[PDB]
């Protein structure tokens, strides 16, 4: 099928990104590491679709701007994490 | 800090004080009016504490006069048992059930073992707490510093001393700590604290000098009780507050002169601690940006009702502090039908207020 | 492999019915089982995790099969496909529930919960109404849905005419 | 591209050969428990280097991520100046650089650009 | 005053902003000048552009010398 | 800036005299290829259902 | 909008973010608005005075980031196969979009994060989360037309939303489970129309807008505090708590009218079985509301006696009393409303 | 051809990335992949302009998280997994074998490279990225860029408020 | 009579969505032909 | 394309985000189709736009043609692996580079 010969690989890569975002690693940063991994794969598919259009790749910039802000915001929340808990370990948070 | 001699004259405010008694200061008021513009060298908080009957009041008034400081008289239960119109609530006590009977310092000195003592001690903490916040509003809105006699920080000493003598129970002490923990953290600690160390024998002599009826006749002011207060001020309170506030200790400035004391205060410098940001000394009053100033001002000027709603900590396993439901109904009937308690202050027509048809205004940081 | 339960009359195609009901037995079992092994039981090791999948799914398969067999057996034995058949069917699965839960009462009472459940399903089949029918009325606006537009950009000219075409 | 990748690999191979020569050409002597000890001015070290190293420019560190992603939007300017509407290109570009300056001066005035103190 | 303080503290932001202000000014001259010449209609066109003599655009052909 | 533009336009003007030439060539060979593909398709898949 | 000028901004940018989503004529445009909304809420939500608040700022961030990420994943996939923002016949690719949106709003199967982040929010924060944050997600689900997936969430929402709430004593955590149930009613109302949903949402926000103030004005966070709470007139306290009944949708009060119009339309559309499970499950929701009313309907209590006085903010209370009045007498104004016909 | 080998590597590096635990091991894996994805994207496009931008953008994020990794997760451990090395190396060669015996006219992506375009396409003879990036700064889509600007600036206000610089540095206490 | 007809009428509208009252979703093509306009505008400007 | 319910002025902001109207082989194909959506509305348009949607999808998505192409290649390989072709004459003559 068309979807299997052309769009399978990025999707299989995407789900592997999510399975990193949920696996049990001690440090919160392990979530941030896997966060921009997924974003890297989202860019890849979005770039497939935008190129089916002849001239629409400019929207890649729009996507990248929101990619950094969620990473940048994701990093700020970690900073605020440290200065109330002292450490970023997942097991240090109240389970609720 | 700069007495009248140092300035050579009366305090000159940097800008006109904000009328904090009449106009609210919310977020949208903070946009046009800023807080830091009014702060001087004298924009500080002073707590003039000591043992029982050490002439703190006289010393404070004189002191607050030299430093152009606002003086706040020490709280007393008259603030609870005398309404605005002046009527004495205590006259209603023959009607009330025994548990809800009025209780004061007179009663404490005369029947200290009564179960209402635990009530009485919490009220004093609550009163100081509200008064303390009122001082902060005056400081932040006017820039003039304030002189307090006893802060809520020092109030747990009396509760602890009463506990050692056995007047209170385990439960009452447990309840008191939870209130204090639930509430104390939201205040700004004083810049300066002054203590008047009168030795234990001296205060016992001194109390008889006042010749107050109930005190001399009482048994509470024993060597053990008065000794407990001394151990509590110096070992727990003073050792703790000195980490934040400058601490001066005198044998008795009430028996001494204050002009020497003011000249002692002005020697103390309050800027050396400013250098390090995280230095504990006077940490609370270190606001980096103008936003932080206004936030603190808003909290005490505009969110005091929140501050006074934290005293709602439900604890019923303690039987002393619980008020029976049948009494509550009766007490509610008598208390709120007294002259001047029908409505909020300034609306009880039977007490002489007029124009209620065309009146719509209510006070700010006012009850109800 | 894809058999529908009511594709045939009630006393028919046993192998068709068992597959249809066991389908829903497995799906519900796994769906609940996923929550059980992660959120409630939390077993450790790759082998015991299967026990939770088997434990929550296994007997739940036994129930569905029991209902089909008893319902199918009753349909032929009595000589009529009536509501009591499904009522008779339900008590079978309830009996399996007790054996699953080792509880005499749990199986008995749950049979009644299941028994009346089946009865109503037969009611639906016999009277001609559905449990989750496709919505006949689906509203996509208010009264002025085509009028309330607030956009500012000028809409450039049209390219289609409602009028009949000219030639 | 495909030319560049080939030379990229060819260079990497060449540079790799250089130490692979150095590793053999290097004089070889028995390694001592002290020869491989870290260097910290001749006195044994108190603290591993893998302890948490405090940070003071964390705030700038985050602002750096942002300011770059606006470099992605200024760079295309030149390429599309001959081809774009001059009002739209002129207006938008200016209100792009004013926004950046205003943001910078705002934080500079608020003192966030200064390090933690 | 203000001018003095900055000119003493951060002279670059004054000089830099002086040229920045120059950009806005002579950007406002050039942009207005651009439509004072009808520069949307450019005498040299990218690609091979051919019009019919009756097309409306065929009237607007900018007529220049070189 | 004038001289660079002068040179660029001269380079571009040379395209417009060559660009029509290539398009003429490509079409006459693009079409010829299409016949071959339409014929290769016929032979390749004679027996497909 | 409580402390500083900065809080004023984040509130507005939240409004802009939500509007961009619900006014966007394409999935990609809609997704952008969600990102705008994301960072508008976090700074409002994070306060370092509380160890709990920063934890709340986390769970929300990880959940929302994943939701928008998976949401964008499917939207790209959706128009990779159809080449349109719309799918002619709904299929799996459209289901995946639905799953993300439900998680974005904390519907039943993916609600877990939602109550578990309510421990460390101020009341004013919970209102923004409970009411406004559910606009953008739920409003996009109106575009997708999968029945069984949406139908399953409703059935689980009312069930999990109710049964879970019985065991709580923290009002903030209790309201979360209460909100999950009302969310179930929306999604049920969303497979039939939107005008009902728009009406029903407005009433739901209205009631929650009221109950939040009463806790917010008097800073109550636990059931015990209700009994210890002091009020001058036990009649007054008795009447304030009569808003819970409206939140329970009892017909003498205004809060039933929303439930009522959702049944007159679901029934009109023959969804009889759904209403049985929903309306029946609402009773359990009505239950723990009464557990709160234990502190009001009985009206002589054993209460601590170191308070004689009520200290309350005027403007909040002034607006709260007005809102409460309609919450009890709002029924006779149904005549005026002309949005149901 | 290298496109298929790029497919193999991006798959291979993703398998291991699922198994990294040490944050820097994750980072090295991620950095390597950011190279390949950047390379791969430019194959199926009229220019590599976006690969340059993407590469530049992520490298900014790469440095910053090392600064925080070296402050928060400084003391952690690696473990060479002989299962992993064999598994990746086993499949990697396996995948590389297929790419040699693949009908790699079929595997090529249908997206039109610049050369894949016709000769008649007059719009393909301009600058490499003129038209594509054009309407990023023309009516009406320009307002989207403007909307980002506030969004980015408003973000810049969010970090300082979340961060609260004045209350100290960051240490893994 | 009127509420058994009005109800019946609404069903027909919903069955075929052939009226702009309630069961009609306005599909606007305005923006795309705005984009086509903008493309045409930019086509003229190209050149130097 | 989707239809916002709100349709406040904000929709003008993001309406023209992604389109086919800028120098595309399918610019005319989509304008007809989407026009027909505007004439009949969204829900009814999905039932009257059978041709326009299929043509537009077969112009952008191109699945219909790519999925012809593999049938030709696979059927070329199937013939050879069955021995029906030969190694020497496996492929046809290549096209000229200066074409297409
Ligand atoms: C070095 C610092 C010098 C002393 C402070 C600046 C004096 C010069 C006044 C310039 C105007 C105010 C700038 C400012 O303080 O930030 C806005 C401050 C608050 O700063 P902020 O830190 O809360 O962030 C503001 C965010 N925006 C811009 C979105 C609102 O006050 C206001 O926002 C409204 C009042 C403006 C006028 C205050 C004078
Ligand atoms: C978060 C942001 C991180 C940004 C930095 C990314 C690169 C940091 C990698 C640090 C080394 C990781 C490591 O220890 O793996 C050891 C691995 C082996 O893993 P290992 O598990 O076997 O190591 C432990 C060994 N035992 C078990 C004995 C204890 O060795 C390598 O091959 C790493 C090679 C690194 C090459 C140098 C990278 C420079 C890149 C420059 C820019 C790109 C050009
Ligand atoms: C509100 C809750 C209502 C729940 C039940 C509603 C349905 C009512 C039962 C309708 C009915 O038909 O019951 C009688 C039915 C006998 O009908 P039948 O199956 O044909 O067997 C005897 C004749 N041959 O036999 C049955 O259907 C069994 C009824 C059992 C009810 C147990 C409660
Ligand atoms: C009480 C708990 C009952 C759980 C639900 C039982 C059930 O799943 O019944 C419906 C199911 C399918 O029946 P059907 O109408 O044919 O729909 C199939 C569409 N794919 O299964 C059936 O075929 C209905 C068989 C009767 C089940 C009665 C259960 C009581
Ligand atoms: C003791 C507990 C033991 C453990 C639990 C055992 C039960 C486990 C059940 C697991 C499987 C649940 C999922 C079943 C899926 C069945 C299909 C479905 O999704 O529901 C639709 C189904 C029939 O669909 P319908 O809308 O009626 O259209 C006709 C279709 N041929 O709708 C139905 O058929 C409904 C059947 C039940 C109706 C019950 C009504 C009476 C309730 C009385 C209480
Ligand atoms: C084992 C895997 C083997 C695969 C090779 C991996 C190493 C990659 C080294 C090549 C990187 C350079 C590159 O490929 O650039 C490609 C592209 C060029 O595009 P262009 O502007 O058109 O210039 C072409 C000039 N002939 O420009 C780009 O795409 C951006 C390239 C940035 C290169 C950064 C340097 C990386 C160095 C290798 C790190 C390992
Ligand atoms: C003509 C423009 C007049 C601007 C007046 C600025 C005068 C003084 C500038 C200055 O640097 O003084 C110190 C002041 C204090 O700011 P601070 O929080 O300490 O941050 C480090 C500042 N170097 O620094 C500042 O607060 C602001 C420094 C940047 C101001 C740039 C304004 C340029 C406007 C054009
Ligand atoms: C023979 C070959 C000689 C080779 C020499 C090579 C030298 C290379 C090494 C240079 C680095 C030297 C050290 C350095 O980095 O200095 C940078 C410079 C120092 O200044 P700074 O530190 O900022 O001052 C104190 C700040 N507290 O930082 C600066 O401040 C420089 C800022 C430059 C700003 C220039 C602005 C120019 C404005 C032009 C217009 C001005 C005219 C008036 C306005 C016109 C408006 C129309
Ligand atoms: C004990 C616990 C179990 C209680 C009973 C649960 C079973 C309830 C019945 C199953 C759900 C609803 C069934 C239904 O849809 O009834 C529809 C029926 C057919 O009417 P019609 O409108 O013509 O159908 C569509 C066109 N063919 O016509 C009607 O029935 C419409 C009239 C209203 C039906 C409401 C039925 C729900 C009653 C719930 C009782 C809850 C228990 C209370 C105790
Ligand atoms: N149980 C209890 N009694 C208190 C407390 N604070 C003050 N008192 C009582 C103790 C004495 O009976 C009496 C002493 O009054 P003060 O020491 O405050 O003297 P006063 O302020 O009237 O003037 P002076 O101190 O002489 O300047 O009030 C308290 O916190 N708890």
UniProtKB/TrEMBL annotation, chain C:
Keywords: Membrane, Mitochondrion, Mitochondrion inner membrane, Transmembrane, Transmembrane helix
Localization annotation: Mitochondrion inner membrane
Principal localisation: mitochondrion
GO CC term, one of those recorded: respiratory chain complex I
GO terms (BP aspect): mitochondrial electron transport, NADH to ubiquinone
Family under the similarity heading: Belongs to the complex I NDUFA11 subunit family.
Record's protein name: NADH dehydrogenase [ubiquinone] 1 alpha subcomplex subunit 11
From TrEMBL, chain F:
Protein origin, superkingdom: Eukaryota
Gene behind this protein: ND-B16.6
Organism from which the protein derives: Drosophila melanogaster (Fruit fly)
Subunit description: Complex I is composed of 45 different subunits. Interacts with CARD15, but not with CARD4. Interacts with STAT3, but not with STAT1, STAT2 and STAT5A. Interacts with OLFM4.
Signal peptide: none
Protein name: NADH dehydrogenase [ubiquinone] 1 alpha subcomplex subunit 13
Location of the protein in the cell: Mitochondrion inner membrane
Biological function: Complex I functions in the transfer of electrons from NADH to the respiratory chain. Accessory subunit of the mitochondrial membrane respiratory chain NADH dehydrogenase (Complex I), that is believed not to be involved in catalysis.
Higher taxonomy: Eukaryota, Metazoa, Ecdysozoa, Arthropoda, Hexapoda
Family, as annotated: Belongs to the complex I NDUFA13 subunit family.
From TrEMBL, chain I:
Cellular location(s): Mitochondrion inner membrane
Self-association state and partner proteins as the record states: Complex I is composed of 45 different subunits.
Function: Accessory subunit of the mitochondrial membrane respiratory chain NADH dehydrogenase (Complex I), that is believed not to be involved in catalysis. Complex I functions in the transfer of electrons from NADH to the respiratory chain. The immediate electron acceptor for the enzyme is believed to be ubiquinone.
Protein family (similarity comment): Belongs to the complex I NDUFB5 subunit family.
Official protein name in the record: NADH dehydrogenase [ubiquinone] 1 beta subcomplex subunit 5, mitochondrial
Species assigned in the record: Drosophila melanogaster
UniProtKB/TrEMBL annotation, chain J:
GO cellular component, one term: mitochondrial inner membrane
UniProtKB keywords: Disulfide bond, Electron transport, Membrane, Mitochondrion, Mitochondrion inner membrane, Respiratory chain, Transport
Subcellular location, record wording: Mitochondrion inner membrane; Mitochondrion intermembrane space
Keyword Hydrolase attributed: no
Keyword Mitochondrion: yes
Membrane-topology descriptor: Peripheral membrane protein
Gene Ontology biological process: mitochondrial electron transport, NADH to ubiquinone
Primary site of residence: mitochondrion
Domain of life: Eukaryota
UniProt-listed InterPro entries: NADH_UbQ_OxRdtase_FeS-su5 (IPR019342)
Positions of disulphide bridges: 26-59, 36-49
Its biological purpose: Accessory subunit of the mitochondrial membrane respiratory chain NADH dehydrogenase (Complex I), that is believed not to be involved in catalysis. Complex I functions in the transfer of electrons from NADH to the respiratory chain. The immediate electron acceptor for the enzyme is believed to be ubiquinone.
Family: Belongs to the complex I NDUFS5 subunit family.
Annotated protein name in UniProt: GH23780p
Organism: Drosophila melanogaster
Chain's gene name: ND-15
